[PDB]
Each structure stands twice: as C-alpha cells, then as structure tokens.
C-alpha cells in the first residue's frame, strides 16, 4: 500500500497541520493514486480516491460508518443525534425511522413556505443595497441557511438579517464547532494554555442546550402544532420499537440539523454563484430557465422542481467542491479490498470525495471544467461515482431539504439580479469541518422584478 | 413689572434649573408665576411665555421674528445655512424656502407615499418576526423608521436601519454630532484640554456627514437620473428672482437639516402616541376600529391615510401634551409693548413654552392633563395660535405635512396589525435633548395575523 512521508513518532500527522488539509490530501492522492495509508499517533486510515475502490467501500454488508475523530469531538454537543451516533446505537435507528418521512421529497411541500420566507428576506436585503455597496456571499448564504433550518426545524426566528452580530445561539454553536475542529490539531490538549478554551466550550454547550430545551418545553406546555421537525419528533413513534424520541435526543437532533445543514448548504450556494460568474454561457442558460419557470411573485414548490438546469448547476458545484468533503468507514469483518489489499475487522477507510469526483475513468479528461450538462442524463452516471451526500442508510438525511433550499434560492437569485465580480476574486477554499469560498464578494444589479 | 423667580447673587436664576429636564422644570415655574416670567443666567436673559393671550402677540411676524437659540447656533456648525439654522434675513433662507415649499405640500405627499410605505412595511415585518418572551424598544424602532423614511424620500438613499445593530456610519456621526452640540450648552471651560477629543470627534463626524451627502449629490448630477425625492427637486428648482438653483453646498445642508429636524420629532410623536393609547383603552379601541375599517387593502393607499381622522386626532392630542420640539425662540424686531403691560426693546428675546401653552385652561378647559383626542373633532373651533407644535408663520415647520402623513400612516398600520401591552408597568420618563421623547418606553406586541 502506498504511503506519504513519516516524521518519526508523529508519523504523517505534520502533513495535516495546515489550514487546508483536504486540499493537501488531494495533492497526495495526485502523487500516490487511488489508495494510500495515513498514520497518526495511535491511529491509521486509508484514503480512497477511485470509484473502483469506493464502490466496494460502499457495500454496507462489508463496511459501516465510522465516527471520525472530528465527529467524536462534535458529539460533545451533538450527542447521540443522527450524524454522531454509531449505526448500532438504539437512538440511531429509532431517530432514523421516525425522521425519514419528515425529510422525503414529499415533505418539502410542508417546508416550502418557511424556506420562501427566508429567501424573500435575502432578496429584499440585496434589492435594498445602495450603488456603492457589495455582497459578502458566504456570509449572507449562511445567514439564510441558519435561519431557514431554525424556522423549518423548530419554528424559531434567529432574525439574522436584522443583525450585525448573530443571535447568541449562533455565536455559541459556531464557536463550539470551531473548538472541536481545533482539537484535531492540538498536541497537548491538557496544557493550562487551553483552560479558557475548555471554559468557553462548556459555556457554549449550555447556551445551545438552554435555548433548545426551553423551546421544546414551551412547545410541550402549549400543545401547539406547527409545520416543523419539532412537531414531528414530539408526535412520532418508531415503527420497530413502538417508542418516541426522548426530550434530550430531540434537542440533539435540533442541534444536529443546524450543524449538519448550515455550512454545507451555504458553501454549495456560494460555490455555485462563484462558478456561474466564471462561466457566462452556463449563467445565461440558468438565468433563462429561472425567468421562464419562476413566473409568479414568489416561487411555488412545483416551480422549484421544474428548475432542472439550476439543479444540474448545483450538482456540478457539488462534483467539484463537495462541501462535506470526506466520510469514514470501518471493515465489519476481515475482507480484501480491490482484490489486492487485505483489511482486518475494524480497519478504517476514508473517502476523499473531491478526488472521487475527478476520476477520469468515470468523468472523462475534462474533470476540472464546470459543465452542468454532465448531469443531463443522471441514469447514465455509474453507481457510487457521485457521493456528495455520503452512502446508504448513513447518507445525508437532509439531501432533499438541502437541494430544495439551494434550487429555490439560486433560482430566485438568478431571476432578480445580474452579478458582477468587482474584485477579480481568486478562489480561496477555507476548510473548517466543511468547504467554502472565503472572501467571495460580488455586486448585484437588480432586474427590478417585484416579489 | 415682570415676574421673575428668586435670584441668587451672580448666579441669578441658574440654581433653579439644575437639571437635564429644563422644559419640565420651567413648566413648574410657569405654574407658580403664570403666563410670563423673566429668567436670567450669567452673560443671558429671556422671557418665557405660556398663555395663548401673549403667544398670539408673539406670533405677529410684523413685530417678532425667529431667534437662533444657543442650541441652534451649535447645530449650525454642521447644519450650516439650512432652513432651520438660518436667520430669516440670510439670502439662502428665503431662496431655499421658496424653492422647497412646493415639495412639502399636502399634494406632494402623494409622491412620497410609496417610499413611506416601504419603510413602514419593514417596521411591521420586523415586529411580526419577533419570537414570543421578545419586546420592542419603541422610540428606538420609531427612530429607525423616521431616519430611513427621510433618507429614502429625501435623497433616495437606504440607511437600512432594520438590517443592523450598529447604525449606518452617517447616522452614528450625525447622532454623535447632535449629542456634542447639546453637551456644549452645559459646558463651562469649553477650551479646557479635557475636550480636545470631543473637538476632534466633532470634526470627524462633520466630515463623515459632508462626504456622504456631497458624494450622493455628485453621483446624482453625473447620472442625470430623476427621482421622486427632495434631491431631484433641489437640483432642478430655480429661484424666480435670480434664476439660480440652490448651490451644491446648501443642498447638502438642507439634506442634513431634514434628517436632524425630522427624525426625532416624528419618532417622539409616534412613541408618545403609542404610550397614551396604552394608558387610554377607550381611545385605543376607537383608533383601532377606524384603522380596521379604513385600511381594507394589504397596504395603505394615500387616500386611505387621509381618511384616518381619529388617528389624526390622536396624534394632535399627543402633540398637545408633549410637543416634541417643545420651544421656539423669538426676538423683537423693534421696540414694542407686549400685552399692553410689558415694554420690550429691539432685540429682546421671547421663548414660547409650547407644553405650557397647550395647558392654558382658559382655552382647553380644566381637564388639560387628560388625553382626549375628541378635543380636535372640530378644528375650526380651536382659537388661533392656541395649538403650535409646528411653530409659527413663515418660520413654521416646512415638514409638517410630511410628519403627519408619516405618523398617521404608521400608527394606522401599527393599530391594524397588533395589540400592544406594557409588560413592565413603565413610568413615563421624558428625556430632553433638542427634542422630547419617552425614554425607555417598551412594549410587547401580539399580532392580529393580518397579512401585508
Ligand atoms: C449541500 C448540503 C449538504 C451536504 C453536502 C451534506 C453532506 C452530508 C454527508 C456527506 C453526510 C454523511 C456523513 C458521514 O458519513 O459521516 C451527511 C449526513 C447527514 N446530514 Fe447532511 N449534507 C448537507 C445538508 C444537510 C442538511 C440541510 C441537513 C438537515 C436539515 C443535513 C443533515 C444530515 C444528517 C442528520 C446526517 C446524518 C444522517 C445519519 O447518519 O443518519 N444535511 N450529510
Ligand atoms: C412631529 C414632527 C415635527 C415637529 C413637532 C416639528 C416641529 C418644528 C418646529 C416647532 C419648528 C420651528 C422651529 C423654530 O421656530 O425654531 C420646525 C421647523 C422645521 N422643521 Fe419641523 N417638526 C417636525 C417634523 C419635521 C420633518 C419631518 C421635517 C423634514 C422632513 C422637518 C423640517 C423642519 C424644517 C426644515 C424646519 C425649519 C423651517 C424654516 O425655518 O424655514 N420637520 N419644526
């Protein structure tokens, strides 16, 4: 098995002590090919980049989801919510079976009006800018995604478009996430220099718990029904066990939806806008469809489904820069990968999604080009070639939500504005637990079509 | 011989006005001493008038003209020779007055109505989107509304106050400049080194205001675009005599002036009206009934606002009790005798104590402290010069029709869309700056769930 340079006891870990480790790992995959071992003190994984090997890794009879160290640190505040649970934990399957119907394509009809509410706020914000002003794209997309998941998730208004400083919940959550990510690159975590970090982390957990627990207790005392995930979780019983989720787990799911959904979806929107700005022919076609389809003052659910080319633009953005760029698996039993590489029970694999998505044997030689027409016939894409939403029963439960949100909002953005890159921005991909184009800014020129 | 409260050696009457609520203190002195009293401080002197009898003489423009109070003189450092801080004799006063009058008529409000609705909808949506425990800071939100409305109607510029915690830098500088000008009134040793930073900041703030407004004027002139705003009217309007428009510098001073003169007075009014409606359930029910009956469309039309008669009366009664620009100052143009009793010399100052005028029991009856909008039901029955919240004559508020159209629209919409409750049992605290407002007034709104 190929492997990058080791540095004594540190092994390969110094190669990930960099602001952009996924990008560095893509460069290693370029050098070493479809599979390479990566060792850190007390752990080992194997990074996979080819569809050939990844299709085996996605065999659920042979491999199951592993909790990466990142996910283990996020569990300190996401608990046994869906994303940070082992498949064999009772609350994983229970929450999965209760929630799956609230996340179907059908269920998006019920969330659509709340998604529209926030999308209109975003458009109105941009319509109201003066000639001298510009848009901070990822910052505004994140205000939108957070507010949308707040409203659809538990009928709560963070009111991000009314503030300079976010709602305290948002500040704590973002800072909690940031700390969990920082712990991955922290060699002496019990050194006194991290006492303040630990104190702040605990304060932030309490801020998130107190708000979400209060909203759950308020809802239960009032008896009111809403079109939100909270109502579904309070009323739902798991078909298998016959049991509903307990209040603590419900809190963890709410926190989980916010964490799992906000930056991934924000990143996607930002990357799509960036690529449209770089590809005028693609832009013209997307904007033509938006104008033809979105004939009403606000989009209907059905109209969003008819934005086919906008959908293709978003898939092509996820091809190039899948915003949750890696997931981790373990071997359920001893097995041989690719007819060549023996693995033992418990051995870890890591899927490098951006590298999968550039497999020339699948996509052709033009893998760096932005061409949404690649997705024109989706039944022609081989199985396990395109995995921005992970795999199998542990795939993104929020896939339909994300894509409905992104299509709606991108359609509306294209219908209402022309966008200019006033700065000749050079793409800078910031890595947190997700990917986004840092510092991406534009100016909008309104088409003056009312809402 | 003129009443005067007790004097204390060189300090004169100044030890009796040791307060940041001088208008309220002066009302108590008027209660004791009556319709007219002299008030001396070291190095100044004026005569406070409280009766309609005397104030009607003071409002004789052949005998008295507007005086620039010390407050107005400090405001002139950044409002320049705009309308509010000019002497009636300054060439730019008469020139600007004649150019701008048609842009402020009742008829002209038809052209501003859509922009006023735009900001009013943003206010209503902000309140609709609050979570249940949240509350409203009334004067703060009313000021966001009035500032943004004058920005949009004045020079088609969006301060976007409902998108922010910290205001647009222009607003921050303007508010801080106003605050400094007010602070100078109570400053002994103004050239002490401890005020160097104040002076530096004041100059920075003037530059911030001038640079933005000058830029917007130059942008407008380069683009050639016409708008429904005061800036378009000032660029095109010509003085009949000279054939000239206002120059670019004066246009800037008028823009700064509209913001200063209009924002807090109108915001105060709205805030006082809401406060009084909360204290008078009978009156509230009647106002809200009219709002529901009149405002039958998803947004108000201009004609509907004109039909909000009782809402208009509520606002006039709020201006009766707490006129938000509470004083104006006059000087004697020539030697003259006031009220057949009090000789005045050329240049002598009078100050109209408007809240005290508005409590003249010989005019309004004994119930002057009650909030009764029905007092205004037949406005032809109110004696001349009895009700002056917008000042007097040619130097009266040019923005009167604007203010009242704004306030009526917004109060109608507020009553249509929400019930309000005072979750704190707030005690009225009337802060005095250049204007009056109910400081700290907070409420919770319960939506009626009527869409926009
Ligand atoms: C473009 C947007 C998004 C992308 C790219 C994305 C990607 C992913 C990926 C790759 C996984 C699997 C992770 C693993 O195997 O360890 C996942 C899981 C998950 N995602 Fe997303 N996601 C997106 C949006 C959302 C949204 C909007 C929500 C919720 C509203 C959400 C909720 C979840 C949840 C709950 C899981 C865990 C599911 C389970 O294991 O049962 N995601 N997502
Ligand atoms: C309830 C709201 C308002 C009240 C109570 C009010 C009151 C007054 C008063 C009492 C004066 C005379 C000051 C003096 O004699 O020294 C005045 C002048 C003025 N007001 Fe207002 N005002 C209001 C709203 C506005 C608005 C909205 C604007 C502009 C859009 C405005 C612009 C002016 C101007 C330019 C003057 C100076 C007029 C001149 O001397 O030629 N006011 N106002």
Centre of ligand 2 from the C-alpha of residue B389, in Å? 9
Q: Coil, strand or helix: which one is A163?
A: coil
CA atoms within 13 A on the CB side of A447: 16
Q: What's the CA gap between B35 and B30, in Å, rounded?
A: 7
Provide the 3-class DSSP secondary structure of residue A27.
helix
Distance CA B146, CA B161 (A): 10
CA A98 to chain centre: 22
Joined together, the tokens standing for residue A186 give 């922290």
User: Is-contact B311 B319, C-beta < 8 A?
Assistant: no
The b-or-e profile of B132-151 (16+ CB within 10 A means b, else e) is eeeebebbbbbbbbbbbbbb
Q: Which two tokens stand for residue B64?
A: 């008295």
Q: Does A162 touch chain B (CB under 8 A)?
A: yes
d(CA A38, CA A13): 8
CB atoms within 10 A of CB B195: 16
Ligand 1 centroid to Cα of residue A389, in Å, is 6
Contact at 8 Å (CB) between A426 and A274? no
Residues of chain A positioned with their CB less than 8 A from the CB of B131: 156-157
Q: Collect all residues with Cβ–Cβ distance below 8 Å to A227 and sequence separation of at least 6.
A: A110, A111, A113, A114, A152, A155
CA dist B435 → B147, B272, B314, B389, B395 (Å): 15, 12, 20, 12, 18
Phi, psi of A398 (to 5 degrees): -90, 10
Rg (CA), chain A: 22
Quote the DSSP letter at residue B35: S
Evaluated on CA atoms A391, A395, A396, A401, the torsion sign reads positive
Q: Binding site, residues of A? A: 47, 396
> What is d(CA B264, CA B338) in angstroms, rounded to the nearest whole number?
33
Residue B390 is among the residues annotated as catalytic for this protein: yes
Instruction: Calculate the alpha carbon distances from B266 to A22, B86, B392, B437 in Å.
Output: 57, 22, 18, 10
Determine contact, residues B4/B32, Cβ cutoff 8 Å: no
B111, B409 contact by CB (below 8 A): no
Yes or no: say if B164 and B276 are a contact pair by the CB < 8 Å rule.
Answer: no
What DSSP element (H or E) covers A337?
strand A335-337
Q: What is the CB neighbour count within 10 angstroms for residue B305?
A: 25
In residues, how long is chain B? Answer: 452
Residue A429 neighbours by CB under 8 Å, 6+ apart:
A20, A23, A321, A435, A436, A437, A438
Domains, chain B, ranges and CATH? 1-452 (1.10.630.10)
Residues in chain A: 451
Q: What is the CA radius of gyration of chain B?
A: 22
**A165 part of contact set with chain B, CB < 8 Å:** yes
**First and final C-alpha spacing in chain B:** 61
Quick check: B45 contacting A, CB < 8 Å? no
Note which residues in 128-157 of chain B have CB less than 8 A from chain A: 129-132, 157
* A234, containing H or E segment: helix A229-235
Which CA distances in Å does A33 have to A1, A21, A302, B109? 10, 17, 44, 72
- Per the structure block, which two tokens stand in for A321? 């820069």
Pick from B233, B178, B160, B162: which is nearest to B402 by CA? B233
Ligand 2 pocket, Cβ-based, cut-off 6 angstroms: B 66, 83-84, 97, 150, 257-258, 261-262, 265-266, 269, 323-325, 328, 389-391, 395, 397-399, 402-403
Instruction: Find the B397 Cα to ligand 2 centroid distance in Å.
Output: 4
Most distant CA pair in chain A, distance = 64
Non-local (6+) Cβ contacts of B186 within 8 A are none
Annotated active-site residue in A271, A389, A401, A419: A389
- Choose the catalytic residue: A38, A396, A401, A434: A396
Between vectors from CA B174 to CA B170 and to CA B177, what angle results, nearest 5°?
140
Cβ neighbours for A8, distance < 8 A, ≥ 6 positions apart: none
Phi, psi for residue B447 in degrees, rounded to 5: -65, 140
Q: How far is CA B249 from the centre of its chain?
A: 24
Binding residues of A for heme: 396
Q: Find the angle CA(B16)-CA(B11)-CA(B51) to the nearest 5 degrees.
A: 45
Token digits of residue A241 = 């066990």
Please check whether residue A334 is in contact with residue A299, taking contact to mean a CB–CB distance below 8 angstroms.
no
B428's CB contacts (< 8 A; 6+ apart) are B275, B438, B441
* Pairwise CA distance, residues B269 & B320, whole Å: 10
Protein residue with its CA nearest to atom 3 in ligand 2: B265
Tokens in use for A32?
A: 């070493």
Residue of chain A whose Cα is closest to the Cα of B223: A131
Q: Is residue A421 within 8 Å of A254, Cβ to Cβ?
A: no
Nearest alpha-carbon partner for A411 in A277, A292, A278:
A292
A217-A218-A221-A227 Cα dihedral, nearest 10 degrees: -100
Q: Whose CA is nearest to atom 43 of ligand 1?
A: A396
Are A180 and A73 within 8 A, CB to CB? yes
Please report residues of A whose CB lies closer than 8 A to that of B219. 131
Q: Which of B261, B312, B327, B329 gets mutated to test ligand 2 (max ligand atoms within 8 A of its CB)? A: B261
Q: Best of B326, B397, B433, B435 to mutate for ligand 2, by most ligand atoms within 8 A of CB?
A: B397
Q: Please tell me which residue in B397, B418, B420, B435 is annotated as part of the active site.
A: B397
Is there a contact between B392 and B288 (Cβ–Cβ < 8 Å)? no
- φ, ψ dihedrals at B424, nearest 5°: -115, -5
CA pair distance A81, A221, nearest whole angstrom: 24
**Nearest alpha-carbon partner for B178 in B143, B157, B155, B205:** B205
Q: State whether residue B211 sits within 8 Å of chain A by CB.
A: no
**Please, is A291 exposed, middle or buried when counting C-beta atoms within 10 Å of its C-beta (0-12, 13-18, 19+)?**
middle
d(CA B302, CA B379) in angstroms, rounded, equals 22
Long-range contact list for A184-191, CB < 8 A, 24+ apart?
A184/A69, A184/A70, A184/A73, A185/A16, A185/A17
DSSP B361-399: HHHH-S-TTS--GGGGSSGGGSPTTS--TT--GGGS-TT
| Helix/strand/coil for A9 | helix
H-type helices in B229-370, by residue range?
230-236, 248-279, 281-294, 302-306, 309-321, 354-357, 361-364
Q: Is B308 within 8 Å of B412 (Cβ atoms)?
A: yes
* C-alpha A436, offset from chain centre: 10
Residues of chain A with Cβ-Cβ distance to B223 below 8 Å are none
CA pair distance B409, B109, nearest whole angstrom = 12
> Do A156 and B131 count as a contact with CB atoms less than 8 A apart?
yes
Give the integer Cα–Cα distance in Å for B232 and B220.
Answer: 8
List CB contacts of A27: < 8 A, sequence separation 6 or more: none
User: Do residue B163 and residue A131 have CB atoms under 8 angstroms apart?
Assistant: no
A375 is catalytic: no
Q: What is the dihedral of CA B222, B223, B228, B231, to 10 degrees?
A: -10
Strand positions, DSSP E, A57-147? 63-65, 135-136
Tell me which residue of A79, A43, A46 sits closest to A63, measured CA to CA.
A46
Is residue A401 in contact with ligand 1, taking CB distance under 6 Å?
Answer: yes
């Amino acid at each position: 098995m190929p492997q990058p340079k080791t540095f004594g006891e540190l092994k390969n870990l110094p190669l990930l002590n960099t602001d952009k480790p996924v990008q560095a790992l893509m460069k290693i995959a370029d050098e070493l090919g479809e599979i390479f071992k990566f060792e850190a003190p007390g752990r080992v994984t194997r990074y996979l980049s080819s569809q050939r090997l990844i299709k085996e890794a996605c065999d659920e009879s042979r491999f199951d989801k592993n909790l990466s160290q990142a996910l283990k640190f996020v569990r300190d505040f996401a608990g046994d919510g869906l994303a940070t649970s082992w498949t064999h934990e009772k609350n994983w399957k229970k929450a999965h079976n209760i929630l799956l119907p609230s996340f179907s394509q059908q269920a998006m009809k019920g969330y659509h009006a709340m998604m529209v509410d926030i999308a209109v706020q975003l458009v109105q914000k941009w319509e109201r800018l003066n000639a001298d002003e510009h848009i901070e794209v990822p910052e505004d997309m994140t205000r939108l995604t957070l507010d949308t998941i707040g409203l659809c998730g538990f009928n709560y208004r963070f009111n991000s478009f009314y503030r300079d400083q976010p709602h305290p919940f948002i500040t704590s959550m973002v800072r909690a996430l940031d700390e969990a990510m920082n712990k991955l690159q922290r060699a002496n975590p019990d050194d006194p220099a991290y006492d303040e970090n630990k104190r702040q982390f605990q304060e932030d957990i309490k801020v998130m718990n107190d708000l979400v627990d209060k909203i759950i207790a308020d809802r239960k005392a009032s008896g009111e029904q809403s079109d939100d995930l909270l109502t579904h979780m309070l009323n739902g019983k798991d078909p298998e066990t016959g049991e509903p989720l307990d209040d603590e787990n419900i809190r963890y799911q709410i926190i989980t939806f916010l964490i799992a959904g906000h930056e991934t979806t924000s990143g996607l929107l930002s990357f799509a806008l960036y690529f449209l700005g770089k590809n005028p022919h693609v832009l013209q076609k997307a904007a033509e469809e938006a104008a033809r389809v979105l004939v009403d003052p606000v989009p209907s659910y059905k109209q969003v489904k008819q934005l086919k080319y906008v959908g293709m633009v978003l898939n092509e953005a996820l091809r190039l820069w899948p915003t949750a760029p890696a997931f981790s698996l373990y071997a359920k039993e001893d097995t041989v990968l690719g007819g060549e590489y023996p693995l033992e029970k418990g051995d870890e694999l890591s899927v490098l999604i951006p590298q999968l998505h550039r497999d020339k044997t699948i996509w052709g030689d033009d893998v760096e080009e932005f061409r949404p027409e690649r997705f024109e016939n989706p039944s022609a894409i081989p199985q396990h070639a395109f995995k921005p939403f992970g795999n199998g029963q542990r795939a993104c439960i929020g896939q339909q939500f994300a894509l409905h949100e992104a299509t709606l909002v991108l359609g509306m953005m294209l219908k209402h504005f022309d966008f200019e890159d006033h700065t000749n921005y050079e793409l800078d991909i910031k890595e947190t637990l997700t990917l986004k184009p840092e510092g991406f800014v534009v100016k909008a020129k309104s088409k003056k079509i009312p809402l």
